[PDB]
Amino acid sequence: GFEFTLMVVGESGLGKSTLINSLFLTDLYSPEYPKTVQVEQSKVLIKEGGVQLLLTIVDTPGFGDAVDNSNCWQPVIDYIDSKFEDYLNAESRVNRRQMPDNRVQCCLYFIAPSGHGLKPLDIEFMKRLHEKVNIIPLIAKADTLTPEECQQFKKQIMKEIQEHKIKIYEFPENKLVKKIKDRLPLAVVGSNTIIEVNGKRVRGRQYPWGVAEVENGEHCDFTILRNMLIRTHMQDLKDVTNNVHYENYRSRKLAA
Amino acid sequence: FEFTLMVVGESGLGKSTLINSLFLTDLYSPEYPGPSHRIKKTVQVEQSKVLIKEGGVQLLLTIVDTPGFGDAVDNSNCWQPVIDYIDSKFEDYLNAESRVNRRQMPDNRVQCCLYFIAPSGHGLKPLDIEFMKRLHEKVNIIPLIAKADTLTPEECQQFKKQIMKEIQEHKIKIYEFKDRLPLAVVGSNTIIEVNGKRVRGRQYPWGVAEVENGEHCDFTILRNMLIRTHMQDLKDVTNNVHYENYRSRKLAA
Numbered sequence: 075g076f077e078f079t080l081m082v083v084g085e086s087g088l089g090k091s092t093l094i095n096s097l098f099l100t101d102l103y104s105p106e107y108p109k110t111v112q113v114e115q116s117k118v119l120i121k122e123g124g125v126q127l128l129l130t131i132v133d134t135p136g137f138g139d140a141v142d143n144s145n146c147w148q149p150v151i152d153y154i155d156s157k158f159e160d161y162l163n164a165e166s167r168v169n170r171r172q173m174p175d176n177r178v179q180c181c182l183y184f185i186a187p188s189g190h191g192l193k194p195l196d197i198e199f200m201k202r203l204h205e206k207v208n209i210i211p212l213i214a215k216a217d218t219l220t221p222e223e224c225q226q227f228k229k230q231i232m233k234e235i236q237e238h239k240i241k242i243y244e245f246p247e248n249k250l251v252k253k254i255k256d257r258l259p260l261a262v263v264g265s266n267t268i269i270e271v272n273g274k275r276v277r278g279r280q281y282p283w284g285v286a287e288v289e290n291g292e293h294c295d296f297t298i299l300r301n302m303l304i305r306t307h308m309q310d311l312k313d314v315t316n317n318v319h320y321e322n323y324r325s326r327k328l329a330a
Numbered sequence: 331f332e333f334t335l336m337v338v339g340e341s342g343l344g345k346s347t348l349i350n351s352l353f354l355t356d357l358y359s360p361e362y363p364g365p366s367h368r369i370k371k372t373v374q375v376e377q378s379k380v381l382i383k384e385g386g387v388q389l390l391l392t393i394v395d396t397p398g399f400g401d402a403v404d405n406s407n408c409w410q411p412v413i414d415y416i417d418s419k420f421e422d423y424l425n426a427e428s429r430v431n432r433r434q435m436p437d438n439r440v441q442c443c444l445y446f447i448a449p450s451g452h453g454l455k456p457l458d459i460e461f462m463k464r465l466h467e468k469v470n471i472i473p474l475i476a477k478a479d480t481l482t483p484e485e486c487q488q489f490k491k492q493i494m495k496e497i498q499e500h501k502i503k504i505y506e507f508k509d510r511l512p513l514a515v516v517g518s519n520t521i522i523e524v525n526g527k528r529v530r531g532r533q534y535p536w537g538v539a540e541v542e543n544g545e546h547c548d549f550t551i552l553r554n555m556l557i558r559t560h561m562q563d564l565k566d567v568t569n570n571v572h573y574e575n576y577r578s579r580k581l582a583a
């Protein structure tokens with residue numbers, strides 16, 4: 075059995091719940107929100123192929139949705155640092171045989187597909203959280219970008235990430251293989267709707283002019299994201315959470 | 331013939347593309363780009379003009395845009411520059427028609443405001459509600475669902491209905507003009523061959539969203555009514571309702 079704590083952040087209506095529900099092809103996440111940002115948790119135990127995953131989904135309804143979003147990152151910081159604080163207290167006890175670990179191991183940050191670059195709120199959130207959680211920036215609703223637009227948008231976002239000295243999670247990796255960092259930020263399409271396309275039933279979004287396919291790597295990066303989040307990089311995300319973000323929290327608190 | 335058209339909405343909603351799609355040529359240019367390229371530390375209202383020669387007819391078009399609207403972390407009062415601009419043009423007109431010698435009477439009143447709603451698929455955002463409630467009695471608001479190729483047909487019908495319900499709930503008076511409201515638009519100046527015919531559209535790997543295809547979006551309806559059929563009625567409502575209401579308010583006080 076594994077445990078994974080995954081945080082989702084972005085303005086309402088970016089396909090976030092749809093994306094979570096696409097991860098296990100199951101509408102297992104139905105948040106009530108479609109005041110100040112509230113940080114909430116949902117637990118799902120997934121048993122599939124003789125393996126159990128206890129997934130905690132941490133969401134932040136209200137983020138970025140108000141006229142005045144001043145300090146809307148602060149409830150997110152408070153939640154994350156409070157789990158570091160609990161862990162530090164738990165491991166400092168004389169008897170620590172029971173160790174709960176509620177630390178947030180990944181944050182999907184959904185970027186609206188404007189076609190320009192990052193918004194001021196995107197920059198503030200990532201600058202203020204990047205040393206506290208593994209940030210995976212995602213271009214939301216990628217089926218609203220043409221391929222040329224998507225490539226320009228990715229390049230502009232990565233340039234601005236560098237400009238603001240933001241440290242995102244980059245998915246550390248006999249023939250040459252394109253580097254994953256060259257694909258970032260991943261651009262996703264979500265759907266559990268099955269559509270017949272040329273005699274094959276696929277998940278996608280049906281428009282009068284055609285179908286944007288979730289699992290088609292020429293349409294979006296969902297398959298790559300799902301493979302890394304659930305299978306190949308989950309342990310590394312936990313490792314960085316513990317060995318970097320938590321250890322940096324602890325050293326700061328103990329030195330003070 | 332003259333017309334003053336305002337566009338308002340957060341950056342990245344296709345606003346400059348839509349203005350560039352209304353006619354045969356682009357209107358924004360590298361020398362005067364769309365409002366997302368003119369953002370300052372505070373929201374601004376900027377006016378530009380172009381002479382359009384369409385169908386043997388000359389249109390002197392003023393475009394008023396508002397760089398930075400809706401783009402900040404704190405968008406408090408970001409509608410105020412728009413209000414100030416609109417009411418200033420009403421003030422200029424009242425001053426002009428109050429002169430003893432009023433032979434000179436320029437008219438710069440804003441005659442239509444396209445307000446771009448992001449296609450979330452849920453409902454209006456708080457900012458959308460605030461803007462429309464605060465401006466609907468100063469200018470003819472035409473709400474638009476931006477980037478409508480973001481929505482499946484069913485999602486779009488649901489989004490339209492929810493927006494209209496919220497418009498009614500908040501008592502917002504949008505420009506009247508048929509039950510396809512708000513119009514959902516797709517913009518593009520890209521010409522694409524689709525089954526042997528050149529059309530304006532947006533080319534995805536899975537197909538082409540056609541801007542002038544009424545089954546793909548409402549751009550044709552907006553273009554025909556804004557530029558051809560309802561332009562004079564927009565001016566008349568501007569003068570006979572919004573300006574006269576400004577004037578009665580100011581002269582009462």
Ligand SMILES: Nc1nc2c(ncn2[C@@H]2O[C@H](COP(=O)(O)OP(=O)(O)O)[C@@H](O)[C@H]2O)c(=O)[nH]1
Nearest residue numbers: 086087088089090091092215263264450451480
């Ligand atoms: N264009 C597009 N729309 C999507 C996608 N995923 C979900 N949607 C639609 O966007 C709307 C909001 O999706 P939802 O998952 O509730 O977003 P949330 O508020 O961020 O959780 C719904 O109409 C969805 O059907 C996507 O990948 N592309």
Ligand SMILES: Nc1nc2c(ncn2[C@@H]2O[C@H](COP(=O)(O)OP(=O)(O)O)[C@@H](O)[C@H]2O)c(=O)[nH]1
Nearest residue numbers: 189218341342343344345346347366477516517
């Ligand atoms: N999906 C979609 N994208 C569009 C549409 N119109 C323009 N775009 C793209 O959206 C991005 C922003 O467009 P722009 O006109 O600069 O928006 P503005 O900032 O509001 O003026 C550009 O990449 C455009 O090519 C549309 O109708 N649908």
